[PDB]
Amino acid sequence: GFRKMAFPSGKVEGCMVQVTCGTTTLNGLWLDDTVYCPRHVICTLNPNYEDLLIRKSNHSFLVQAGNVQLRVIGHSMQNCLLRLKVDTSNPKTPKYKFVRIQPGQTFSVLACYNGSPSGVYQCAMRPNHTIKGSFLNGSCGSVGFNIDYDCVSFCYMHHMELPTGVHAGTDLEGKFYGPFVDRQTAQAAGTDTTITLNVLAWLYAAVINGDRWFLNRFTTTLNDFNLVAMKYNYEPLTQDHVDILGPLSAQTGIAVLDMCAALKELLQNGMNGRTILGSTILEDEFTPFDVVRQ
């Protein structure tokens, strides 16, 4: 029973607001007396965000926190975000911090529309700095997050979809993940590589679940595995990654470099139709932490 699970969303739900500018509406995040939303809410295509921002008043921004309307007492631009100062502090803001998530790591997304939380799901920051999210028109300002004890770590705010169907956005300081810009010009994600650390954790999960048909007695070095991995657009494995896999190595008695020799043969010979935990595809959005926790 190994499932993609999201963090409970309640602490974040109390922070979700609707921000409207003229006719374009999206979501904002209300912490203390400040509200964060994508800056492209002030748009009507090569926009000059300094020029459009100077042309706006505090009254132009309609901020609705559920029933009640909040008044912007001031505003400023932080990279690709706006920070709206509001007259009132959210009584429900939790202990929180902003963090910059790293490729391979996961977080939960609270998909919201019109300031109302709609659904919650888990995904991963891919190596090409996009995410395979679920985002419809109106979802901008939806936030991705992790929770550790009582503290919410915010790491993502949604801005855009790319032509490949995947998604791009920023941390909570407004810096984009990846080389993307918030204008609707042609933009392309880089070639997506596979999160090798996560495929390896999934193989440990499978071995723990009772299918070990893919294990072998061949051996590999870290360097000779990385050389093969990159030919197949898998991420090279670091020695920190080997260390992170230690507990699953011990629990199963399969050395990390031996699991790499298994993976190596799967890359080179494919799966002649066989399945691992039920699919002909190696899953790369389950971390070593997820396998350990289940």
Ligand X SMILES: *[C@H](O)[C@H](C[C@@H]1CCNC1=O)NC(=O)[C@H](CC(C)C)NC(=O)OCc1ccccc1
Per CB under 8 A, residues contacting a second copy are 1-11, 13-14, 110-111, 117-121, 123, 132-136, 165-167, 273, 275, 278-281, 294
Does 40 qualify as catalytic in the annotation? yes
- As a three-state string, the secondary structure of 229-293 is HHHCCECCCCHHHHHHCHHHHHHHCCCHHHHHHHHHHHHHHCCCCCCECCECCCCCCCCHHHHHH
Smallest distance from the beta carbon of 284 to a second copy, in angstroms? 12
68 binds, among a second copy, ligand X, none (CB under 5 to 8 A by kind): none
Smallest distance from the beta carbon of 228 to a second copy, in angstroms? 22
Does 59 qualify as catalytic in the annotation? no
Distances (CA, A) of 96 to 5, 12, 93, 172: 21, 10, 8, 11
Smallest distance from the beta carbon of 70 to ligand X, in angstroms? 20
At residue 263, φ and ψ (nearest 5 deg) are: -50, -45
* Active-site residue identified among 15, 21, 37, 40: 40
Closer to a second copy by Cβ: residue 111 or 254? 111
Distances (CA, A) of 291 to 52, 198, 213, 244, 257: 48, 10, 19, 12, 18
Q: How do strand 143-148 and strand 106-113 relate by DSSP bridges?
A: antiparallel
Closer to a second copy by Cβ: residue 11 or 39? 11
Closer to a second copy by Cβ: residue 117 or 169? 117
36 binds, among ligand X, a second copy, none (CB under 5 to 8 A by kind): none
Which two three-digit tokens encode residue 256? 């990390």
* Active-site residue identified among 140, 158, 159, 260: 140
Closer to a second copy by Cβ: residue 24 or 118? 118
Q: State how far the Cα of 199 lies from the Cα of 288, in Å rounded to an integer.
A: 9
* Contact residues: ligand X, CB under 6 A: 26, 40, 135-140, 159-163, 167, 182-184, 186-187
Annotated catalytic residues are 40, 140
